Amino acid sequence: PPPKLVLDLERLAHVPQEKAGPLQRYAATIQSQRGAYNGKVLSIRQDDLRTLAVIYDQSPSVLTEQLISWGVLDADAR
Numbered sequence: 447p448p449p450k451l452v453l454d455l456e457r458l459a460h461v462p463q464e465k466a467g468p469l470q471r472y473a474a475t476i477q478s479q480r481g482a483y484n485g486k487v488l489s490i491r492q493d494d495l496r497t498l499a500v501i502y503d504q505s506p507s508v509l510t511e512q513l514i515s516w517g518v519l520d521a522d523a524r
Contacts, residue, residue, distance in 0.1 A: 449523050451495055453488045457517045466516065468501050 453473055458466055476490060477483050499506040513519035 448492050451490045451492065451523055452520060453490060454486070454518055454520075455488050456486055461516050461518065466518070469498060469513075469518070472498060472501070 455473065458470060458473065463470065472494070473488055473490070476488065476494070495506050495510065499509045502509050502512075504512070510519060510523055514521055514523065
């Protein structure tokens with residue numbers, strides 16, 4: 447059972463939008479589809495990580511490492 451993929455929306459909003467752009471919009475799209483827009487965090491699907499990976503032309507694991515270093519993802523997602 448893969449550990450949760452919980453995004454820190456606060457920190458994600460603060461990362462240079464030249465790198466976090468696509469991730470920010472992806473997260474906003476989920477908030478829209480869910481109808482839930484207010485919240486400090488946002489848990490996303492394992493599928494989304496694999497989708498995001500492609501967007502960034504990286505392995506899911508390597509994208510995870512980057513997200514962790516941005517503080518957007520907790521170290522608990524390994």
